[PDB]
């Protein structure tokens, strides 16, 4: 399969990237170095992950070593929820650029549609534990993202965790200058996202699947929770193809025309997870994997369920 997908800004995006949420700061520099050595050309980052400095050390060294050229890398980061106001967006982007030691991002996403009160805390709370919202709306935050393109800080802009009505709001924005290039959403066999994916694809927005392995290292995992990597039905498809379960879980979104960003800090898994471009799942395999949907969503915050822009009350 071709390694890159064409975005609606005219640039090409590698369909396989390395995730970095939860990658410890003392391990992520080596993880990213290994990833680049073994072929990864897309790294998914965020300021809220608190490890962009260390990701940046790896990127800079591989550029300095001339393992890769900057134009061959596709670096993604995300605007955190406490920076949705007009006067904070540029500085938030520039902090990410400075940490990653880059002079542009390939893609910058609104991390969540929910804006929070600015300040030092990433989740500012009231005395009862509700997140304290910002009043800045989605559309004004989008205009601030458009400015970043026009200032040369980012080559593409997009969104993450937006439901279809929220995507539609941006597409219908008065005076829209740049369409979102990407919507990055949770997607795996237990949360297959058909409706939202079809909507986004019909509008020319590329979907990136996050937590493709079901995020088994999520901090709030419980022992009884469903496990994609241990699902015997998925293991059986993997065995039939002489591949690992993770390799099937990565190839699955690729064949749906999605980008996918599995996370690992384990060198052997980083290399293994990239070895997915040379086998095919059948149509029957694809439909069988889709059949496992249980609307099992792992990534959301209880503190945000009354925010006006909470994305997951809507069906999709
Ligand atoms: N936009 C958003 O709101 C959002 C939300 C969630 C995630 N994301 C992005 O998506 C990325 C991926 O999602 P995620 O980190 O939630 O989880 P994930 O990629 O679904 O799963 C990561 C877990 O799988 C393990 N793993 C990786 N390869 C494996 C293999 N071959 N065999 C067995 N286990 C394997 C990792 O272990 P080791 O690391 O120990 O090897 C880690 O515990 C994130 O890192 C982040 O970049 C974005
Ligand atoms: O968000 C990610 O990429 C991965 O998850 C995290 C990573 C962190 F470093 C710190 C917290 C989270 C987290 O709680 N996310 C969920 C989240 C965040 C913001 C708003 C909402 C909401 O429900 O509106 C939901
Ligand atoms: N998203 C969940 O299902 C979840 C479950 C338990 C938990 F303690 C946390 C959780 O998500 C993170 C959150 O609510 O901040």
UniProtKB/Swiss-Prot annotation:
<feature type="binding site">
    <location>
        <begin position="10"/>
        <end position="19"/>
    </location>
    <ligand>
        <name>NADP(+)</name>
    </ligand>
</feature>
<dbReference type="GO" id="GO:0047939">
    <property type="term" value="F:L-glucuronate reductase activity"/>
</dbReference>
<keyword id="KW-0597">Phosphoprotein</keyword>
<dbReference type="GO" id="GO:0009055">
    <property type="term" value="F:electron transfer activity"/>
</dbReference>
<feature type="binding site">
    <location>
        <begin position="211"/>
        <end position="273"/>
    </location>
    <ligand>
        <name>NADP(+)</name>
    </ligand>
</feature>
<dbReference type="GO" id="GO:0047655">
    <property type="term" value="F:allyl-alcohol dehydrogenase activity"/>
</dbReference>
<keyword id="KW-0560">Oxidoreductase</keyword>
<dbReference type="InterPro" id="IPR020471">
    <property type="entry name" value="AKR"/>
</dbReference>
<feature type="site" description="Lowers pKa of active site Tyr">
    <location>
        <position position="78"/>
    </location>
</feature>
<dbReference type="GO" id="GO:0002070">
    <property type="term" value="P:epithelial cell maturation"/>
</dbReference>
<feature type="modified residue" description="N-acetylalanine">
    <location>
        <position position="2"/>
    </location>
</feature>
<keyword id="KW-0521">NADP</keyword>
<feature type="modified residue" description="N6-acetyllysine">
    <location>
        <position position="222"/>
    </location>
</feature>
<dbReference type="GO" id="GO:0043066">
    <property type="term" value="P:negative regulation of apoptotic process"/>
</dbReference>
<dbReference type="GO" id="GO:0005975">
    <property type="term" value="P:carbohydrate metabolic process"/>
</dbReference>
<dbReference type="InterPro" id="IPR018170">
    <property type="entry name" value="Aldo/ket_reductase_CS"/>
</dbReference>
<dbReference type="GO" id="GO:0001523">
    <property type="term" value="P:retinoid metabolic process"/>
</dbReference>
<protein>
    <recommendedName>
        <fullName>Aldo-keto reductase family 1 member B1</fullName>
        <ecNumber>1.1.1.21</ecNumber>
        <ecNumber>1.1.1.300</ecNumber>
        <ecNumber>1.1.1.372</ecNumber>
        <ecNumber>1.1.1.54</ecNumber>
    </recommendedName>
</protein>
<keyword id="KW-0443">Lipid metabolism</keyword>
<comment type="similarity">
    <text>Belongs to the aldo/keto reductase family.</text>
</comment>
<dbReference type="GO" id="GO:0046370">
    <property type="term" value="P:fructose biosynthetic process"/>
</dbReference>
<dbReference type="GO" id="GO:0036130">
    <property type="term" value="F:prostaglandin H2 endoperoxidase reductase activity"/>
</dbReference>
<dbReference type="GO" id="GO:0035809">
    <property type="term" value="P:regulation of urine volume"/>
</dbReference>
<dbReference type="GO" id="GO:0043795">
    <property type="term" value="F:glyceraldehyde oxidoreductase activity"/>
</dbReference>
<feature type="active site" description="Proton donor">
    <location>
        <position position="49"/>
    </location>
</feature>
<dbReference type="InterPro" id="IPR036812">
    <property type="entry name" value="NADP_OxRdtase_dom_sf"/>
</dbReference>
<feature type="binding site">
    <location>
        <position position="111"/>
    </location>
    <ligand>
        <name>substrate</name>
    </ligand>
</feature>
<dbReference type="GO" id="GO:0005739">
    <property type="term" value="C:mitochondrion"/>
</dbReference>
<dbReference type="GO" id="GO:0044598">
    <property type="term" value="P:doxorubicin metabolic process"/>
</dbReference>
<dbReference type="GO" id="GO:0044597">
    <property type="term" value="P:daunorubicin metabolic process"/>
</dbReference>
<dbReference type="GO" id="GO:0072205">
    <property type="term" value="P:metanephric collecting duct development"/>
</dbReference>
<dbReference type="GO" id="GO:0047956">
    <property type="term" value="F:glycerol dehydrogenase (NADP+) activity"/>
</dbReference>
<keyword id="KW-0963">Cytoplasm</keyword>
<dbReference type="GO" id="GO:0006700">
    <property type="term" value="P:C21-steroid hormone biosynthetic process"/>
</dbReference>
<comment type="function">
    <text>Catalyzes the NADPH-dependent reduction of a wide variety of carbonyl-containing compounds to their corresponding alcohols. Displays enzymatic activity towards endogenous metabolites such as aromatic and aliphatic aldehydes, ketones, monosacharides, bile acids and xenobiotics substrates. Key enzyme in the polyol pathway, catalyzes reduction of glucose to sorbitol during hyperglycemia. Reduces steroids and their derivatives and prostaglandins. Displays low enzymatic activity toward all-trans-retinal, 9-cis-retinal, and 13-cis-retinal.</text>
</comment>
<dbReference type="GO" id="GO:0001758">
    <property type="term" value="F:retinal dehydrogenase activity"/>
</dbReference>
<dbReference type="GO" id="GO:0071475">
    <property type="term" value="P:cellular hyperosmotic salinity response"/>
</dbReference>
<dbReference type="GO" id="GO:0004032">
    <property type="term" value="F:aldose reductase (NADPH) activity"/>
</dbReference>
<feature type="modified residue" description="Phosphoserine">
    <location>
        <position position="3"/>
    </location>
</feature>
<dbReference type="GO" id="GO:0005829">
    <property type="term" value="C:cytosol"/>
</dbReference>
<feature type="modified residue" description="N6-acetyllysine">
    <location>
        <position position="95"/>
    </location>
</feature>
<dbReference type="Pfam" id="PF00248">
    <property type="entry name" value="Aldo_ket_red"/>
</dbReference>
